[PDB]
């Protein structure tokens, strides 16, 4: 069906976009996985710095930690909606990686 074809192509697109952002994605796993979070709810943060930078050369291993406070906490809903939402997630990652190129495009446009 036409619908089914589009679904497959969306997943193909996610893959292609992930291939483009690959390097930046891995640079955001050795840094931003232990950086940006915004999921902690309730009141304030008890162990302030231990709850972020020390949590869970280009491709590092488990030098820091493993996955103690759920590495896949982020990957839960992320992979939960592998269709639609993830297409836009991949789009953002691409433009975050290639923001220099985005600027150039806008100025000539």
């Amino acid at each position: 069906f036409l619908w089914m074809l589009g679904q497959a192509l969306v997943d193909e697109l996610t893959r292609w976009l992930q291939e483009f952002t690959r390097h930046h994605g891995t640079m955001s796993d050795v840094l931003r996985a232990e950086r940006y979070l915004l999921t902690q709810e309730l009141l304030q943060g008890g162990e302030v710095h231990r709850g972020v930078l020390d949590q869970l050369a280009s491709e590092l291993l488990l030098d820091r930690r493993l996955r103690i406070p759920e590495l896949e906490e982020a990957e839960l809903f992320a992979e939960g909606q592998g269709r639609a939402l993830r297409l836009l997630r991949a789009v953002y990652q691409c433009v975050a990686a290639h923001s220099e190129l985005l600027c150039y495009f806008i100025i000539i446009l």
């Binding site: 979070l37 915004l38 709810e41 309730l42 304030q44 943060g45």
Partner: protein, 47 residues
Amino acid sequence: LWDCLILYNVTVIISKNMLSAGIIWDSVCFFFLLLQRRVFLSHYYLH
């Protein structure tokens, strides 16, 4: 800084009251400014 921006918005609306263009957009701004001023929490925004 956010409160000073709120005051700027207020004064625009209040000076437009004493006319002698519209406050519609300035009221949208007021809403958003007030929203963000409020969301500067010491809890959720502290995160």
